[PDB]
Design a protein around this ligand. Structure first.
Ligand SMILES: C/C(=C/C=C/[C@@H](C)C(=O)O)[C@H]1CN[C@H](C(=O)O)[C@H]1CC(=O)O
Ligand SMILES: C/C(=C\C=C/[C@@H](C)C(=O)O)[C@H]1CN[C@H](C(=O)O)[C@H]1CC(=O)O
Lengths: 149, 194, 48, 97
């Protein structure tokens, strides 16, 4: 309106508006080892060591049958502990990402002052924020004037 | 013997539902521990009225909040207006001891916070910079020294002496609690028959 | 949406003045507040 | 070393860096110092606030600043057997045993 009141224009051959660009979060890593994320290599190596130990135990049991059942039950509940812990961890950070609400509105960007936002200086965006009467874009104008440089 | 079949089926049934209930309890506990966000930045403490926050009393920090228009900073301003006699302290060390003892947050100079965290390991800096200003030397109005002071500050900045002088002066967690129990289970598995 | 005024009428100039009048007063903001208003029934609230 | 003065350093008793009164409009400390020219300079770390800059002159800045949040590191989480067997009660554990 300032440019139109200063000088004449032609017909607008197309109609457009101001919208918001954000970086798409590429926090997903390769599916391989993705289910190993809840798993722990270090505890994975420790479980490998535990299996080796159970094997050596069975070996000495004959080269040093209630004791075989005791060893198998101990190893079985040990693997059940491993399975329950891994399933709990995997469902935990599976529910981390799906409970997250990302940015989908300008009002969310108006509330979120951690993520910086702005536009080109001496453009029509700051002109519209100067002539903004809605309090959301007024707070946008107050934020971009606060981080003036 | 169908009695052994009944006993084995009932035993598998209750062992599986105890294992499933323990897995569900551990998943709920880990999901609550993950949902408990420990980050207490500027957008976090805008609505977190349980944690006290503030600054040194009648300083330049809420003077910036006196003229603040951002709604997060307006929330900080209204919270320090509501609890003005409590969360505001006269010196820096009173707020430092309030942070160390009570559930308190303190908003002050980042260089002082950097020096304190250099000299004390018990404190952290979270978030970033709320504002962005500089240190101006206090001069009278229309001062003839102030032009020479500005020229000397420009000369010392181009010499870089202030930057190196400020450089010298005033600068497995829960998974770790798992394999110990597995090693103890290995110890009890060794002490069976061999 | 607009008004189908006669051609050359001063109603077009009155509407042109009124556009800047409502933009400087924010009449679309209170129009959105008053008449595009939830008179009951808010948006899709997720019940668990 | 730059300007060549015999600098005299002494203390104030006003107890503040400078703040205008809420109902009187009166400053204190360094601001009333440099209004009345009681001393030529006040070498203190002072932010370039426009309320103070509209009263007294300010020099160009030499180092930046920023209001930052101060907090601690209250992290425990001892990695033990009790933390491993946490989400069920031990009375339930011995009853299952
Ligand atoms: C991308 C852009 C930048 C403007 C920069 C300023 C410094 C200018 O050239 O006046 C332009 C593109 N055409 C618009 C215009 O001038 O009408 C402007 C975008 C905008 O104003 O938001
Ligand atoms: C710690 C400090 C001042 C101490 C007390 C306050 C109440 C004051 O008198 O300004 C300084 C540090 N530099 C800031 C400045 O540039 O004035 C100021 C911080 C503040 O005033 O909140």
């Amino acid at each position: 309106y300032v440019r139109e009141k200063v000088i004449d224009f032609s017909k607008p051959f197309m109609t457009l508006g101001i919208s918001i660009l954000y970086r798409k979060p590429n926090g997903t890593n390769p599916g391989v080892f993705s289910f190993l994320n809840p798993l722990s290599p270090d505890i994975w190596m420790y479980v490998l060591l535990a299996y080796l130990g159970v094997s050596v135990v069975l070996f000495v049991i004959a080269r040093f049958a209630l004791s075989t059942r005791i060893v198998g039950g101990i190893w079985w509940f040990f693997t059940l502990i491993i399975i329950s812990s891994y399933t709990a961890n995997l469902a935990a950070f599976l529910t981390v990402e799906r409970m997250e609400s990302p940015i989908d509105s300008a009002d969310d960007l108006a509330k979120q002052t951690k993520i910086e936002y702005g536009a080109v200086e001496d453009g029509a965006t700051m002109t519209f924020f100067k002539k903004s009467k809605i309090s959301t874009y007024d707070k946008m104008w107050a934020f971009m004037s606060s981080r003036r440089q | 013997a169908l009695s052994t079949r009944i006993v084995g089926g009932i035993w598998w049934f209750f062992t599986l539902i105890i294992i499933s209930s323990y897995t569900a309890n551990l998943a709920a506990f880990l999901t609550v521990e993950r949902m408990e966000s420990p980050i207490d930045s500027a957008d976090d403490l805008a609505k977190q009225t349980k944690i006290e926050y503030g600054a040194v009393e009648d300083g330049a920090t809420m003077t910036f909040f006196k003229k603040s228009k951002i709604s997060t900073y307006d929330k900080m301003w209204a919270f320090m207006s509501s609890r003005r006699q409590s969360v505001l302290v006269k010196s820096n060390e009173e707020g430092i001891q309030r942070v160390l003892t009570s559930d308190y947050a303190f908003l002050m100079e980042s260089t002082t916070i950097e020096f304190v965290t250099q000299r004390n390991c018990n404190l952290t800096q979270i978030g970033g910079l709320i504002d962005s200003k500089g240190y101006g030397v206090g001069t009278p109005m229309g001062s003839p020294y102030r032009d020479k002071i500005t020229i000397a500050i420009l000369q010392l900045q181009e010499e870089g002496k202030l930057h190196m002088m400020k450089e010298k002066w005033w600068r497995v967690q829960n998974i770790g609690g798992i394999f110990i129990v597995l090693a103890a289970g290995l110890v009890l598995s060794v002490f069976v028959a061999v | 949406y607009g008004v189908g005024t006669p051609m050359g009428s001063p109603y077009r100039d009155k509407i042109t003045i009124a556009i800047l009048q409502l933009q400087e007063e924010g009449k679309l903001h209170m129009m959105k507040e008053k008449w595009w208003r939830g008179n009951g029934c808010p948006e899709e609230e997720s019940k668990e | 070393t730059i300007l060549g003065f015999t600098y005299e350093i002494r203390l104030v008793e006003d107890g503040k860096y400078g703040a205008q009164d809420d109902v009187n409009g009166q400053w204190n400390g360094m601001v009333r110092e440099l209004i009345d020219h009681k001393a030529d300079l006040a070498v203190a770390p002072l932010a370039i606030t426009y309320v103070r800059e509209k009263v007294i002159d300010f020099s160009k800045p030499f180092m930046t600043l920023g209001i930052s949040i101060l907090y601690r590191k209250p992290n425990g989480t001892n990695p033990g057997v009790f933390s491993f067997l946490n989400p069920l009660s031990p009375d339930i554990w011995m009853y299952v045993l």
